[PDB]
Chain A
Amino acid sequence: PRSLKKGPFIDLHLLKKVEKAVESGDKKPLRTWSRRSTIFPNMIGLTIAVHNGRQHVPVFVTDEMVGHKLGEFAPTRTYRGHA
């Protein structure tokens, strides 16, 4: 976890992107390479396509997802089973 006196972490380009999507008011997805960014409350209800290494998996920001990083909802290593 981060320190509490530092505040929550987000990229500047992601914050500009989500504020552009708020002033634009649309619900079209936006593809990001910013897995290390904490989900903010203004992002709720818009699908974000987070990079997992190959592709961009679209995750829908719910109310309960508002504490975690974006990359926590994008699995990087695929594994099904050894048989």
Chain B
Amino acid sequence: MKKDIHPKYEEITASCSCGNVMKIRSTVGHDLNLDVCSKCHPFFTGKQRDVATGGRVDRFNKRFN
């Protein structure tokens, strides 16, 4: 790669909120803090949670007796 036209690419350590650490090479210039990562996301584990897709008859048997 050419010398001066590219921005500096420093290896930093981003820290996930659930406890993961991840050394990446990036150009932000400083260390960085995260919240959600490849671990501890609602899609990546399996807690995807579609809603009840009709709780109507369950609502009728819960409301009325």
* A positions within 8 Å CB-CB of B: 4, 7-8, 40-41, 63-67
A66 to B54 CA separation, bound complex (whole angstroms)? 10
Between A4, A7, A67, the greatest number of chain B beta carbons within 10 A of the residue's beta carbon is seen for A67
* B positions within 8 Å CB-CB of A: 54, 56-57, 59-61, 63-65
Number of A-B contacts (CB under 8 A): 22
Which residues of B are found within 8 Å of A66, using beta-carbon distances? 56-57, 60
Which residues of A are found within 8 Å of B61, using beta-carbon distances? 41
Listed by A's residue number, 20 A-B pairs whose Cβ atoms lie within 8 Å are A4-B63, A7-B64, A7-B65, A8-B60, A8-B63, A40-B60, A41-B57, A41-B60, A41-B61, A63-B54, A63-B56, A63-B57, A64-B54, A64-B56, A65-B56, A66-B56, A66-B57, A67-B56, A67-B59, A67-B60
Which residues of B are found within 8 Å of A40, using beta-carbon distances? 60
Q: Is the interface of A mostly helix, strand, loop or mixed?
A: loop
Nearest-CB distance from B57 to chain A (Å)? 5
A64 to B63 CA separation, bound complex (whole angstroms)? 16
A4 to B60 CA separation, bound complex (whole angstroms)? 11
Nearest-CB distance from A80 to chain B (Å)? 31
A17 to B65 CA separation, bound complex (whole angstroms)? 20
Between B54, B56, B57, B59, the greatest number of chain A beta carbons within 10 A of the residue's beta carbon is seen for B56
